[PDB]
Write a protein that binds this ligand. Structure first.
Ligand SMILES: Cc1cc2nc3c(=O)[nH]c(=O)nc-3n(C[C@H](O)[C@H](O)[C@H](O)COP(=O)(O)O)c2cc1C
Lengths: 309, 126
């Protein structure tokens, strides 16, 4: 077999120059799950410049300067997290791939998280003044509680442990942004910024698959390690999740200070922390009280919550 | 006499949920070259991929001998799909004319296991 006596170019480039390189094979696929994911993310391609945000002006203009500034800051916070995952996180996954197709899928993830970041710019272009936009960038730079979150994950992307890099890569789309995503869903339950909410539902339709895929690939690799080193990786996951829940709770308490959302937003955050754990193959230890949010807000996320005959 | 028929892809989320339940379970094969025959009544538990119903589950239910024994459906997925969350359950409900009993996420929570165990007991006595 050509495959078993050759390496992928990225394997050749970073890990093993001793063998010759093989072209990607899309006709003989090691894992069919890669084709499912590839087909879905590529057919789900979208641009925010194709959603009309200008219909949010009537509801946006009725919000006082307090709420407008909160939306601009929150979204500018999410833009930073997407910028991290697009420029660092997702491209770092490529070289640590189990399969050839996984390399290409993480190139798609990087690009699409880049489109997520860009989508906030198009919202701002239509809704926000130059001043509101520039104030949010200053606030994001000078907010240590905000900065601490990305600062905790980035070292795992640049270090030489691929499984900790993978867990970080799964933690971003799986948990870190939901505290912020609470806000647009909160407003769209009250009939405010409904078009903006459509961009968020498109972002999350991408995020859900990013989280699933990174968690699925994490599980394939840990299964090959001994029971002792498997328990050690589980320890690191919960230790990291504990630290990131701590940093997120701090951040959200400051972000939502005066608006009285923090509690609900943190519960939404932990609902998704539970989902992050399930996507890595661990049970959710979170109670119904810790993870409950108002139905009207949850309905904005999902309203649902060959044949012979 | 409580029986589950389930489908699960290579990711095994639905498989792992079903193993946490009390009721005996039979797996629909991933390999489309393979089929099963079920001769007892069962609750169907399937994930969603939107073609919302996995092709292997359509093949299973396309056998009149198999689909006559369905006592209802439970469907899984992820709420991040919005209007598409767990729509395999509804689609199967409409085709078979059987009740949609429950909806859940990934490998299920502690709550989901308690409710499905109860709903399977109450479905086989009703
Ligand atoms: C490509 C892809 C498409 C999916 N489509 C849906 C969907 O339309 N609705 C939904 O609720 N979940 C959807 N899911 C989530 C799966 O149903 C969920 O991960 C499930 O737990 C997988 O079960 P399994 O591991 O037994 O296959 C999708 C997942 C993937 C990877």
């Amino acid at each position: 077999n050509y495959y078993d006596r050759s390496v992928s170019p990225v394997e050749y480039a970073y890990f093993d120059q001793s063998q010759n390189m093989r072209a990607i094979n899309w006709n003989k696929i090691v894992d069919e799950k890669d084709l499912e994911v590839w087909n879905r993310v590529t057919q789900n391609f979208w641009l925010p410049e194709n959603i009309p945000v200008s219909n949010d002006l009537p509801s946006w203009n009725e919000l006082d300067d307090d709420w407008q500034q909160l939306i601009t800051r929150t979204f500018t916070g999410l833009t930073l997290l997407d910028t991290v995952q697009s420029s660092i996180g997702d491209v770092a996954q490529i070289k640590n791939s189990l399969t050839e197709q996984e390399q290409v899928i993480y190139a798609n993830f990087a690009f699409m998280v880049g489109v997520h970041a860009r989508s906030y710019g198009t919202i701002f272009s239509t809704l926000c003044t130059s001043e509101q936009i520039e104030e949010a960038h200053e606030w994001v730079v000078d907010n240590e509680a905000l900065q601490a979150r990305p600062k905790a994950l980035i070292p795992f992307y640049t270090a030489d442990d691929p499984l900790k890099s993978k867990i970080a890569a799964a933690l971003m789309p799986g948990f870190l942004l939901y505290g912020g995503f609470y806000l647009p869903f909160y407003l769209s339950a009250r009939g405010k910024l409904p078009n903006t909410s459509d961009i968020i539902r498109l972002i999350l339709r991408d995020k859900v698959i990013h989280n699933f895929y990174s968690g699925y690939k994490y599980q394939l690799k840990v299964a090959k390690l001994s029971p002792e080193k498997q328990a050690e990786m589980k320890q690191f996951v919960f230790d990291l999740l504990d630290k990131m829940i701590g940093l997120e709770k701090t951040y959200l308490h400051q972000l939502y200070d005066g608006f009285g959302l923090a509690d609900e937003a943190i519960r939404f955050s932990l609902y998704n922390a539970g989902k992050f754990l399930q996507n890595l193959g661990y049970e959710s230890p979170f109670t119904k009280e810790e993870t409950r949010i108002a139905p009207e807000v949850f309905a904005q996320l999902s309203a649902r919550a060959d044949w012979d005959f | 006499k409580e029986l589950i028929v389930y489908f699960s892809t290579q990711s095994n989320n639905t498989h792992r949920f079903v193993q946490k339940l009390d009721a005996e379970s039979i797996r629909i094969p991933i390999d489309e070259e393979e089929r099963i025959k079920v001769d007892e009544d069962y609750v169907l538990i399937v994930p969603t991929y939107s073609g919302a119903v996995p092709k292997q589950v359509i093949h299973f239910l396309n056998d009149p001998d198999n689909r006559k024994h369905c006592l209802g459906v439970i469907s899984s997925g992820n709420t991040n799909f919005g209007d598409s969350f767990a729509i395999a359950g509804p689609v199967i409900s409409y085709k078979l004319k059987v009740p949609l009993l429950y909806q859940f996420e990934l490998i299920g929570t502690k709550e989901d296991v308690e409710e499905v165990n109860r709903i399977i007991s109450e479905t086989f006595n009703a």
